[PDB]
Design a protein around this ligand. Sequence first.
Ligand SMILES: [Cl-]
Ligand SMILES: [Cl-]
Ligand SMILES: [Cl-]
Ligand SMILES: [Cl-]
Ligand SMILES: [Cl-]
Ligand SMILES: [Cl-]
Length: 958
Amino acid sequence: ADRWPLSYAQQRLWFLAQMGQAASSAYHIAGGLTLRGHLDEGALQAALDRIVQRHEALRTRFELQDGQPVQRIDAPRPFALFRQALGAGEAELAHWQQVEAQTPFDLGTGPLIRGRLLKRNEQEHVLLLTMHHIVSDGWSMGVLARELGALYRAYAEEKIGPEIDPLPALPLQYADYAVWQRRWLNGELQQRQLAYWQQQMAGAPALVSLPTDRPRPALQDYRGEVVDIELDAALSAGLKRLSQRHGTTLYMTVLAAWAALVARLAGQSEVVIGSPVANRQRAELEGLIGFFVNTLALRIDLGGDPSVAQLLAQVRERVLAAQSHQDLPFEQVVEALKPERSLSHSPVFQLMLSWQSGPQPGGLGLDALPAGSRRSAQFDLSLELQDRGDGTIAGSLTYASALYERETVQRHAGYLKALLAGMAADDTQPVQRIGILGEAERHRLLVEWNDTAREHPRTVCVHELFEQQVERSPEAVALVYEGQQLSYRELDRQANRLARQLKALGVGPDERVAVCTERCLEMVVALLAVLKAGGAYVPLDPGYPAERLEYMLADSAPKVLLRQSGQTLEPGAGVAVLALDGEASQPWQAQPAQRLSRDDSGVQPHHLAYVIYTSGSTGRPKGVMVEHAGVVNRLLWMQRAYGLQPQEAVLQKTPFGFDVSVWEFFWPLAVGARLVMARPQGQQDPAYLVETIVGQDIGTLHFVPSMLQAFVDSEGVQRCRGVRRIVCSGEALPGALARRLRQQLPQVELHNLYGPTEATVDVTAWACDAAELPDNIPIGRPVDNTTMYVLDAHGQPVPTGVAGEIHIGGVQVARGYLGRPELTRERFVPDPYAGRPGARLYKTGDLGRWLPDGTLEYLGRNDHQVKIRGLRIELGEIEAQLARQPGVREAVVLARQDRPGDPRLVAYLLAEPAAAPDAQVLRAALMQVLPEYMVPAAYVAMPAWPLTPNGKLDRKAL
Ligand SMILES: [Cl-]
Ligand SMILES: [Cl-]
Ligand SMILES: [Cl-]
Ligand SMILES: [Cl-]
Ligand SMILES: [Cl-]
Ligand SMILES: [Cl-]
């Protein structure tokens, strides 16, 4: 009664079996062989009987002893080979090998190895062989088939007596290996390898952030499908030559390839790829049939932007260092590491790469049988390659169906094949500069989704768009400011009168003119007069402190300051002050109202139209110099896409220091509509906006998302039934706010626009016309004559769904920053995708990605990125889940970076009038919908949001 102990891997399967969790097909080692030719059924029986005679693991039962399990061994016995028939057909054979992989074993009585001899013809059989994983592994099937083929060829063809064993005796058995392991796990060598893996995996990314077609569920879906993958002869020989030159194996070279590709796609510097390893280092163990295989986590780093040779050198050492510590079980590694085991994904790694040797290179043709169609997706992606004897490298890429689509995985293999080709071609280049996109996807990202060319007039300025409209519609109303009105002709006369006094002074092409005034009729007269005079207008909002105005006034270095009456702003010497209204304005109001000749101004579309300064969030304000031709294209597109009618009205409600006011001014003036100048900000009642919309019948309106929220919640918002369009710019628009505007005002058409001040005004637009609106409202498709690109660190287009830096190109890119050329050269780079002489490209610093439908998605700034566990976090997904909770009206989540290198998530709430929210109610209910690392630590309530001068949400005031 000899009772031997279990190995660590066997005790885990026994513990899982007692709980009823070792019932999967992954715990059965199934194989098959097709036997073409006449079959000596007596010799095949003698071969199977000798295998169980040799390997006492195939005679092993499992039972209890003093509470703990033991490894009982029986005496040799004949093999349980079941004979049956088999009809020809791919489906009939796939059924019986599915039964072999599905049917459970009896660990108490056995046997733990079985087979089926499926007879097809009198000279063709299919031998299926299946054994439990507590007794075998993948290497064991190779030993079983190799040992079976030699025993049959000796008993059948050589006529060796079944009495004797024609193969060499085993030096030891699996029970000997278990006794050695139990003594090893209690010694210092186990402490060394556990100490190595903690240090090696310290700070590694817990979860990969590969872009998936669907979000990953709370409970992992183990269902999976497969995508074939094959490398042709030229690539395989090039990879074998590359591996020989750098001292790596084909496994190491593919590992460096996949880890480099996943780094680009997931937006992470480090990638952790799992891999099985045959724990058969002792040469005596290579011929045994036992549970030996172990898992190794390989941590690859690409933060240094390495070359091909430097990445291969890294993977070489990290694999050899991992293989020199493979004795430690992987379950003790995941237990010794910090990250918590989640039900949504696998621990430590979510991607696995595996390699295996080729087929075995007679009378009976023992050809191998391929695996079944079904594959259990134990991880997100599983790459399993082999070196075939014909000179190619082929395998299968198994993907979890709940995460990816079949089309997405086919592109993933295409990236890897193209990446491997670049590594074999040139080993000196940086591995992340290698091209991976196919010709179809590259042409779709660069050309098809940038097909925005339009033949607009390019020899016209913004003031000429107005001069062409006053001749078509002179007697129609153009400006409305508190009862007073001005026709298109009277406005053109007032602008021409002021333009002559500016032209009498030193105003000309590219000269600046500062305009300091609150909203009135003279504000639009000043702007048109500056453009007519040939210069560019610099808006100076008097609501800002005098310190800011005196800086923008000195930095712009204008020729004239157009100042309102009650304004104490004073400029420096050299520049002339000129009154805009009041008694001090009669010098220019007495000018002839005749229009200035085009050759007198000398203005051109390539000259400056305005210089609007930035808010100064990351330094002092910068003057963005925008030319005439860019504003014309921006205005002509807005009319082409929305079609403003001459009878409609537009409300000038955005501060004219905000470049959104540009189209609020000149779009209705270039088409024929009337512009209602709203009352100045400091003189407005909370109910002023609602009564001004219905009082003046405003057609087109603009809001920033945080201001649109106050408009929806204002008193009497449903009275604004005459509104046709609402445009959103500045912030990101939540889907919950868009769906609430859909109910309050069903007739209005909401549009989402994106664009920095350096790209004229806006460059992309998206209509909220879908019946189903997403939580993340896309910024849309580019506008006319402007291209959009999502580039990586090397300025190259990233694949679809991959995050990168948004780059803007076309005619709307600004000339640069006034008086700061070095910053312009850094963020106004040449455009290589245009094919034009000196076309430029603006670096926005905004993170974004292309969606499969050809639209762009805003992902925030690069400096405002939040990461937990080395994984990017979308704070909008947390704010949206808070708003769904009862008792909460609005929510904002921020990342307060304390002393630890792991920021604290603080949530800010606007409560519903019913009651104030409770922290435990929000904590528990949100703990179920979101993971543990996305639940805020503290929740605070506020009466209202603090706002910026432009109406945006002031997150720094929170
Ligand atoms: Cl370290
Ligand atoms: Cl390990
Ligand atoms: Cl494609
Ligand atoms: Cl903006
Ligand atoms: Cl918000
Ligand atoms: Cl804090």
